[PDB]
Amino acid sequence: LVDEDAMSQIRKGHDTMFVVLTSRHKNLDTVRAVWTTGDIKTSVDSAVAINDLSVVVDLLNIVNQKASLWKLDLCTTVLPQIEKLLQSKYESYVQTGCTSLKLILQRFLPLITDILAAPPSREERLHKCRLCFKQLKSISGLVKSKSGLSGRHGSAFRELHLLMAS
């Protein structure tokens, strides 16, 4: 291609890149300022309120690395974000949601099952478990709606369907 053509093709996207990255960094700075308090759930809630999905993804990619930072309460915020990410056109967004979902299932499903199986302070851990179960059931319905036929992210949804077959 000619120089003028190559440069035009390159320059066309620069203004958007600059603005998108500036805004993303501003939003990450806000989230980071809450994160340093050690209140992980409030940090994630702040990211959700800002409603920059790329920042939710970046933050989950961080928290997905250390399951020990997850409290039961955090699942009530993350599960709805997983459902949203599982409907993304971006394979990497789906993958981030799948990773968060696998972490939650491995860390909290036994506890959730124990709490919900108990016979009729403590009513707060029970309340959180009941909410997590309904949110997990919602994701289960989504995965089942998407795995009967191999779709855009068929491989990821086949794996999720098998994992959640319980």
Partner: protein, 78 residues
């Protein structure tokens, strides 16, 4: 240098950055700046030199933005 290759590598750097794959974005940003540096070295036309240097400045802006985002992400302690 192949201009088509430079265009493609800018596109890939930007796509990785937009999708939060900052490690790969930086590889492509630094790689394409090296390619533009080599191309500029061959440019004698003064008008083309000015214009390609301006592209080089703009890509540097984006690359620095990604680097600074990565620094902030690394600041999240687990």
């Amino acid at each position: 240098m192949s201009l088509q290759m430079i265009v493609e590598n800018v596109k890939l750097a930007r796509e990785y950055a937009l999708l939060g794959n900052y490690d790969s974005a930086m590889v492509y940003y630094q790689g394409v700046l090296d390619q533009m540096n080599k191309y500029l070295y061959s440019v004698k036309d003064t008008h083309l030199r000015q214009k390609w240097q301006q592209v080089w400045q703009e890509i540097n802006v984006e690359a620095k933005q990604v680097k600074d985002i990565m620094k902030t992400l690394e600041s999240f302690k687990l």
